[PDB]
Amino acid sequence: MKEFYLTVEQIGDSIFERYIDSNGRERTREVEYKPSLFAHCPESQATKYFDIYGKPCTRKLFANMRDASQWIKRMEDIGLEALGMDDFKLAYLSDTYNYEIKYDHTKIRVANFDIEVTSPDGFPEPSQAKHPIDAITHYDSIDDRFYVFDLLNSPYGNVEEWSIEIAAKLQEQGGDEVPSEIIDKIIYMPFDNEKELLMEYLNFWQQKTPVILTGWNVESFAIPYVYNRIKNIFGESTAKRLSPHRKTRVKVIENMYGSREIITLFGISVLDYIDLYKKFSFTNQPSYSLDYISEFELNVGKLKYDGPISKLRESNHQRYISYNIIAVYRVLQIDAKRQFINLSLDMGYYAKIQIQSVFSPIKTWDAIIFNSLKEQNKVIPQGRSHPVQPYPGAFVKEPIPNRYKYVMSFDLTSMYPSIIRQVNISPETIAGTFKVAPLHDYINAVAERPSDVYSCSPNGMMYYKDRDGVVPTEITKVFNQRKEHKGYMLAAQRNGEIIKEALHNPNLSVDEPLDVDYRFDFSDEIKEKIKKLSAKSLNEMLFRAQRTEVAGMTAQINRKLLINSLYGALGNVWFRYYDLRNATAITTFGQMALQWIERKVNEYLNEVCGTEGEAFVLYGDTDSIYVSADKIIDKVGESKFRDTNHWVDFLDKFARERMEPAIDRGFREMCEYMNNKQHLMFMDREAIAGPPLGSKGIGGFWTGKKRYALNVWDMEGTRYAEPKLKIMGLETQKSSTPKAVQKALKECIRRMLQEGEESLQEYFKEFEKEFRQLNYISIASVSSANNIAKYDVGGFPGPKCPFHIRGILTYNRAIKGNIDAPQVVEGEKVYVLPLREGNPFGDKCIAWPSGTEITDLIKDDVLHWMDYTVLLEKTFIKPLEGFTSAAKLDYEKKASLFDMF
DNA sequence: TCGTCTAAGCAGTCCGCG
DNA sequence: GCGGACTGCTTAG
Ligand SMILES: [Ca+2]
Ligand SMILES: [Ca+2]
Ligand SMILES: [Ca+2]
Ligand SMILES: [Ca+2]
Ligand SMILES: [Ca+2]
Ligand SMILES: [Ca+2]
């Protein structure tokens, strides 16, 4: 097999590399890598190296990496550009793996671990590590085993051995319900004392050294705790055995409000699963506890126990250990679903970077571009300092707030990456500038043609047309990968809808789910067999289809994220290729494109309808347009339609055969006007929306920019078994809105769009009457909590104190004295509830850590003093008032002359 | 929240507005 | 009470 790296580090003048050799064996080597850098040289000098602008360069070969680094400094002292890859390990990888890497994940040791630490006096601080580590569960992907290290004797209590037999039993048998599928994979090791546990753990770690290290909060908690505890007990040299090169660094992580410390283990790639999840999941969660996320992702029940976790080991050590094992397994289950480790490996090996660098699109793109240019003997420029400067973004149309009955939406495929490719926007393709007219002059095609030679953007920039820039070339490769995975995702989605339909008529039989690839549209033979299956088999197939769709979603949306982040990197001062001329060229072309096509679509539809000056495009944001189809439906007449699906087919046909060709023509003209390199503005129909045929539903409404709801029957070619609400920006979509209020507002919207005013009024009247019974957590607001210190003046709110911070300060006073009740953590999330006048807490609200029950000593008082009236008015009635006034209807029945009877 | 970008919404504080 | 200046937070792209 072809060799591939696992990890790479620079330590002084050595590169330390762990890798898989040609026989599939893990090896480690130390290499005295001699880097090269470059300087500009005179024209009359036969070199093969040229900078990205075609200027000749001479290669400088250094005796060692420190010499190269010293040379860079002196070049700054002189005031001359020092060209080339200054991150020497990336140059090492490029030289060592000069081919497309094919990796074998089965050879990469992926470790998932979690530790337990009993602490009587509050949260056990990793930097102090003053309490014994009393449990470690470490899952190894190569062995496929959970290694359990269990401390039986501690200053906080001596306990009996954990029993695998009780662990496997149902909770109704007094057991822990450790999943049967992992029972045989547990290797249990009890220990008489902490010193022997840790020494054995280090010997184990040496035998089975993680390449990828993950878990939940491992970077902020488990790793620094283990490191510091070993350091405290045994000394520094022993703690450094966590690094296969015996090198570590205490690294400070800084932001706006303060800083924290993590341990860098040289030769390990730490990918904390919480960080993978936050970057790649495209969720915003009220809480990031593993328990909360596991429930959300897997629909598993909360890991339940009595008393505080600080007394769990001594009260129920059996459960204590079982829950530690289950916690490790939960992370593996989330990854089986979301596949973020797979994603990270794919991206890391593609770019030829340290796997942990996948968190940084700037590092990722720097390496992709460097490797690309190196292939042509071209030399990358030196990174420079730039001051942060604001620059303009997308256009968003101001909608008229209203109901909108029939709506068709259209959207540009991968807009900004397509603009880059179409215009040929790249650091080395800049050709010059032209004199800019106001944007509306280009939008209305009255401005002079910018250039007869170069490819243009309406911000004044011109680009070469003779060859593709490196940015268009590399962005195209990732875009093409994204396109493939989006295809699999959408097929799985369509396949899912086939199963949902069949589930309406499940056969009374005993059978099996079909063995199929859900990434491909089901054949006619599969569709025929599906119609004969039982509900059991259909449900299992639906689960599998939805898992395939999730897998596809991860792969496609994060490739989209990467290419969109290359645009973003052009506007980030730390990117080697930062250039606000290119960043604004992209965004300004984008503004033109949307408003250009708005004009074209209006002109086309006014023509086919025989009207003048009427606005069919009701809304647009960045690269999308929303087209009122009322007049199209009214031209055939509603009475002519057999059912909802009949008018959906008609609009689908109209959009594909009439609108899209008109849109394509409009964009081809715009491409010619700007003299672009290649027409790539492809705007396809997205949603078909409207009320159910014969109903009183309003179909859709807009309240303002970035705030609307639509009843959608077909989305990007997926025809739903049941209509789906597409709600953007409204309170139902915000993590700050209480869970039960999100649910109630969504039902109000469903009724508005599908059923009408009377239905909405029935539901509102019931929610208002019953809501006081809702669980306090389900009606609590949520917020991030930054700068608690700033607003704390002797335990009381200072000037301009935010409402949620005020709640935290109330909480802090109520739990004062306790180093056992949960503390609010700076920068994390809190639940917030309003408090009625005259309460014992002495303020108008209280806040506590999100994803948790409020501590029992104040729980009863919070419950007694909760202000349900304020809660209802603020989270539910206020937003609903906004929805209903925009849609021109009433959530409460107004008086009529019929009341006389 | 270490980690690519801008546009823009709403909640809330403070305070004017005769 | 509203809304403007402002902070804070959270969305849509
Ligand atoms: Ca735990
Ligand atoms: Ca798009
Ligand atoms: Ca599309
Ligand atoms: Ca059937
Ligand atoms: Ca869009
Ligand atoms: Ca206001």
Numbering used by the authors: 1 to 901
Task: Quote from the publication.
The replicative DNA pol from bacteriophage RB69 (RB69pol) is a member of the B family and is responsible for DNA synthesis of both leading and lagging strands of its genome. It has extensive sequence similarity to human replicative pols α and δ and therefore has been regarded as a good model for B family pols. Our previous reported 1.8 Å resolution structure of wt RB69pol showed that L415 is located right below the triphosphate tail of the incoming dNTP, where a small hydrophobic cavity exists at the tip of the L415 side chain. To provide a structural basis that could account for the different kinetic behavior observed among L415 variants and wt RB69pol, we determined the crystal structures of three ternary complexes: dTTP/dA-with the L415A mutant; dATP/dT-with the L415G mutant and dATP/dT-with the L415M mutant with resolutions ranging from 1.80 to 2.04 Å and Rfree values ranging from 21.3% to 21.9%.
Interestingly, the rotameric position of D411 as observed in the wt structure is restored in the L415M mutant. A more rigid anchor of the metal ions would likely facilitate the alignment between the 3′-OH and Pα of the incoming dNTP. Interestingly, when L415 was replaced with Met, an amino acid with a longer side-chain, the base selectivity was not compromised.
